[PDB]
Amino acid sequence: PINVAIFGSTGSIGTNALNIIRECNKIENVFNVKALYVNKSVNELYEQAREFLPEYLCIHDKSVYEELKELVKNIKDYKPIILCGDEGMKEICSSNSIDKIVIGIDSFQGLYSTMYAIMNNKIVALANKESIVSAGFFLKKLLNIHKNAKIIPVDSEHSAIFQCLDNNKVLKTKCLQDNFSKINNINKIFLCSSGGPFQNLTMDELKNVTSENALKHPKWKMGKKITIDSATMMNKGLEVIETHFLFDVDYNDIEVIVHKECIIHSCVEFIDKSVISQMYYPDMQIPILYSLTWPDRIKTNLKPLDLAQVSTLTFHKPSLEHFPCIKLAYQAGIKGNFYPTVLNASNEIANNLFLNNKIKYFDISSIISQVLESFNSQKVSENSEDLMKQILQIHSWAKDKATDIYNKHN
Amino acid sequence: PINVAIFGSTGSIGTNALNIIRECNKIENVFNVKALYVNKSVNELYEQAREFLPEYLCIHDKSVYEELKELVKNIKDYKPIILCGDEGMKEICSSNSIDKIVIGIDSFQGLYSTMYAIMNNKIVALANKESIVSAGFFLKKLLNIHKNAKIIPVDSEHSAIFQCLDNNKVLKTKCLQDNFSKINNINKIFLCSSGGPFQNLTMDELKNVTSENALKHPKWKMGKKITIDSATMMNKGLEVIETHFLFDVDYNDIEVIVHKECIIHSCVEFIDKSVISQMYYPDMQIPILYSLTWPDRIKTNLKPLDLAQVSTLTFHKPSLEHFPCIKLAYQAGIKGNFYPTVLNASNEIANNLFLNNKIKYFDISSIISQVLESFNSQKVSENSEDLMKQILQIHSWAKDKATDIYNKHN
Numbered sequence: 009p010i011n012v013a014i015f016g017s018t019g020s021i022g023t024n025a026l027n028i029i030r031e032c033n034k035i036e037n038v039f040n041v042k043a044l045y046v047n048k049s050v051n052e053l054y055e056q057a058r059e060f061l062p063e064y065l066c067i068h069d070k071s072v073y074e075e076l077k078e079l080v081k082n083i084k085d086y087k088p089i090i091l092c093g094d095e096g097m098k099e100i101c102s103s104n105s106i107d108k109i110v111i112g113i114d115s116f117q118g119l120y121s122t123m124y125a126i127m128n129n130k131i132v133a134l135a136n137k138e139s140i141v142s143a144g145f146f147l148k149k150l151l152n153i154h155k156n157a158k159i160i161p162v163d164s165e166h167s168a169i170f171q172c173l174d175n176n177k178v179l180k181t182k183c184l185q186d187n188f189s190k191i192n193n194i195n196k197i198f199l200c201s202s203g204g205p206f207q208n209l210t211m212d213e214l215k216n217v218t219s220e221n222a223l224k225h226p227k228w229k230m231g232k233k234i235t236i237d238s239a240t241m242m243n244k245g246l247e248v249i250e251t252h253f254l255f256d257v258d259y260n261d262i263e264v265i266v267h268k269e270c271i272i273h274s275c276v277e278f279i280d281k282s283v284i285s286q287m288y289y290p291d292m293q294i295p296i297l298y299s300l301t302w303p304d305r306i307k308t309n310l311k312p313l314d315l316a317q318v319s320t321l322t323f324h325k326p327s328l329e330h331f332p333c334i335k336l337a338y339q340a341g342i343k344g345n346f347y348p349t350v351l352n353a354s355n356e357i358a359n360n361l362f363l364n365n366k367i368k369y370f371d372i373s374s375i376i377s378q379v380l381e382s383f384n385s386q387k388v389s390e391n392s393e394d395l396m397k398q399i400l401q402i403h404s405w406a407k408d409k410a411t412d413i414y415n416k417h418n
Numbered sequence: 419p420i421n422v423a424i425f426g427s428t429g430s431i432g433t434n435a436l437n438i439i440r441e442c443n444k445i446e447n448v449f450n451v452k453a454l455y456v457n458k459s460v461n462e463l464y465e466q467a468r469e470f471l472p473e474y475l476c477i478h479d480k481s482v483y484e485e486l487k488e489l490v491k492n493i494k495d496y497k498p499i500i501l502c503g504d505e506g507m508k509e510i511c512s513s514n515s516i517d518k519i520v521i522g523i524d525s526f527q528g529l530y531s532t533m534y535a536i537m538n539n540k541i542v543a544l545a546n547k548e549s550i551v552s553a554g555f556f557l558k559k560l561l562n563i564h565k566n567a568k569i570i571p572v573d574s575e576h577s578a579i580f581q582c583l584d585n586n587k588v589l590k591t592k593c594l595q596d597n598f599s600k601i602n603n604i605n606k607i608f609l610c611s612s613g614g615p616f617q618n619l620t621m622d623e624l625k626n627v628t629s630e631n632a633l634k635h636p637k638w639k640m641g642k643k644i645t646i647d648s649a650t651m652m653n654k655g656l657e658v659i660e661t662h663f664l665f666d667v668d669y670n671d672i673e674v675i676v677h678k679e680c681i682i683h684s685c686v687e688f689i690d691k692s693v694i695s696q697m698y699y700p701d702m703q704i705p706i707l708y709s710l711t712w713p714d715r716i717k718t719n720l721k722p723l724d725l726a727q728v729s730t731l732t733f734h735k736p737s738l739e740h741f742p743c744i745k746l747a748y749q750a751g752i753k754g755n756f757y758p759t760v761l762n763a764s765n766e767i768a769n770n771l772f773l774n775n776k777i778k779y780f781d782i783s784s785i786i787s788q789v790l791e792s793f794n795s796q797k798v799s800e801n802s803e804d805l806m807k808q809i810l811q812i813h814s815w816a817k818d819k820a821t822d823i824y825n826k827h828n
């Protein structure tokens with residue numbers, strides 16, 4: 009059986025993970041949910057523990073910890089280990105009964121848990137793209153030290169790419185390794201994008217789009233931060249950098265393609281020029297499930313893809329004039345060093361300013377550009393602990409610089 | 419280095435094979451062309467010999483053997499073994515210096531050369547679909563005896579399917595082996611079709627179509643027999659039975675889909691419902707090359723796929739009223755026994771009659787239908803030589819039965 013821990017079990021990734029685990033387990037007993045970890049949602053955690061009966065429970069916020077002890081006494085034939093805070097998270101990662109960990113947490117806590125899962129040589133199903141973009145150098149170093157640890161991508165485009173690779177080759181290497189693309193015979197990547205709500209808009213219309221325009225008309229219902237990133241196409245920009253780090257693909261060999269139907273999730277061109285792609289209805293359960301079953305697949309009862317009903321698939325080039333965030337992401341990635349850390353941090357501020365109606369659409373890319381131009385390349389620390397501190401310092405500096413630029417103009 | 423024999427080196431498959439070998443060898447010395455076999459085309463064989471310098475030359479026609487011998491004296495520093503007929507073909511197949519054999523011949527010579535390749539435990543890159551459809555039981559039996567022989571599909575849709583599979587699983591089985599689909603986690607196949615030249619005709623327009631119409635201004639230039647089969651969609655019918663035999667996929671799990679752009683070459687749905695597809699411009703060099711490099715890939719200088727330029731891909735269900743040959747193929751496959759042998763043989767006659775303007779479009783399916791209805795299932799022979807004789811007997815009966823029906827309504 010596959011022993012799995014879910015970090016952030018009441019978030020979107022976590023709930024989708026538990027839903028597909030539930031459905032697959034009805035078909036055949038495949039998964040043992042060993043651990044659940046949430047921030048502060050005691051009642052939701054209790055209800056999950058009542059169904060999945062994990063050996064470990066953990067909650068971050070200590071003011072709801074004692075409530076969790078009293079609630080789980082209601083569950084018959086069940087004596088779980090009930091833990092708190094960052095210290096519980098570490099004991100879960102070191103537990104020898106856990107093989108795979110789904111990281112469904114954003115920001116620093118996602119990176120911190122990822123770090124501990126890798127230190128304990130686990131398979132890490134990673135759905136936090138910002139951690140790869142910001143701390144890719146640190147994750148690469150850590151994965152070279154902890155040779156049995158693996159990152160398996162959950163982001164849909166990256167899962168699609170991963171699914172297009174031959175496991176006879178993949179098993180000779182692992183994600184984030186130097187030479188991954190060479191071993192897998194990868195020549196080039198088509199990174200598919202929905203395009204967001206603004207593909208048909210003129211430059212003059214883009215000047216005055218609001219956060220309500222981005223959030224009120226979604227194709228896909230998702231969180232506010234990623235919804236804004238989808239609108240500016242900075243989501244895809246971040247995903248270009250994620251692609252480079254995960255698969256060791258040069259930036260000149262990564263192409264963003266707008267595919268509004270969201271059936272083809274991305275494609276891999278091999279060195280012979282044959283192209284392989286992965287397809288399904290938009291549904292995060294497939295990428296999540298593959299991350300937990302890889303290198304095998306298991307039966308599901310999901311609706312089969314009806315290609316004749318779909319009927320038409322379309323592809324076009326994104327306009328870099330209309331979506332300058334894409335260009336900025338390529339520029340940062342190509343310049344290398346900590347420019348991706350700077351890009352991610354400045355976007356975090358700009359995205360939130362736009363979300364709260366403080367700035368306009370082209371101010372987002374204007375602020376990010378100015379912060380990138382202000383950054384001086386730094387010698388990359390050889391020491392793992394110094395490197396993490398270097399990444400955090402640069403992240404903090406870039407957020408501050410973005411905010412000062414906003415304050416000056418305001 | 420990969421040591422290759424090409425059977426039918428001056429036909430379409432053979433010429434494409436030598437073209438891609440030449441171009442790949444310019445990039446890196448990968449292939450040794452060890453043997454070339456042709457029916458009659460002595461001058462063309464000489465030109466190929468001058469370039470590729472194979473250890474073996476074989477010509478089927480005894481009357482040009484002395485001519486070939488004399489021509490080859492013009493080639494500097496070159497002393498090939500020059501052979502003739504079925505005996506020369508047997509000698510090439512049994513050479514320890516040949517690893518892989520491309521079968522680019524039709525009809526008896528194709529089946530016979532395939533048989534000898536398998537008996538000598540070679541990798542057999544098979545482009546003759548009619549051999550699988552007509553003699554699938556015999557090939558299965560022979561591959562069970564000769565455990566190290568392998569059939570690798572060259573037919574473009576079947577190559578596409580093969581390229582969509584995980585080689586970590588393919589290497590634990592082989593084509594035409596029972597349980598191939600289970601081991602590879604296959605649920606369902608989308609078998610892509612161009613639709614042929616008559617795809618948008620009304621029933622009234624279909625009644626009148628001639629072979630000249632099928633052959634003129636074609637989307638893809640290919641041989642006359644396959645062009646007529648593409649027009650009736652019996653090409654796809656035969657390919658459904660080919661899919662069943664190569665991959666052990668049930669007929670209810672094979673769907674024919676009309677994809678007029680011919681970019682997606684076929685798709686595989688796995689048991690989790692994720693779908694993987696293979697794409698390129700229509701070009702037989704990719705499927706041929708993959709058959710010779712499998713389980714690896716090598717570099718080419720082929721034009722990269724420009725998805726944005728292609729722009730739109732479409733998919734629709736074929737009409738079984740307009741293309742009754744598809745229905746007849748499924749019926750024959752599902753009934754099993756030697757019904758596929760009968761279908762292939764009766765189509766061979768009906769195709770040729772329509773090609774030569776002797777019968778109309780709907781007479782093709784009428785003739786095939788009547789021969790199929792007349793056939794009575796037989797006990798399948800246990801001995802492999804008895805089985806080969808049984809298949810050849812049924813093939814000959816079905817051709818004669820088709821011709822009789824033609825002569826009765828003449």
Ligand SMILES: COc1ccc(CCC[C@H](CC(=O)N(C)O)CP(=O)(O)O)cc1
Nearest residue numbers: 164201202203204228238243290291292
């Ligand atoms: C496999 O399931 C889905 C779900 C939803 C969708 C549509 C949203 C795609 C993407 C969100 C994302 O980054 N994802 C899902 O990873 C928004 P974009 O930047 O491409 O404009 C596609 C596929």
Ligand SMILES: COc1ccc(CCC[C@H](CC(=O)N(C)O)CP(=O)(O)O)cc1
Nearest residue numbers: 574611612613614638648653700701702
């Ligand atoms: C990979 O290269 C090509 C070349 C040509 C084409 C177009 C012809 C496709 C097919 C011929 C065939 O059976 N083939 C190539 O295997 C004719 P249909 O029955 O689908 O109507 C597509 C792909």
Ligand SMILES: [Mn+2]
Nearest residue numbers: 163164165247
């Ligand atoms: Mn994504």
Ligand SMILES: [Mn+2]
Nearest residue numbers: 573574575657
């Ligand atoms: Mn074909």
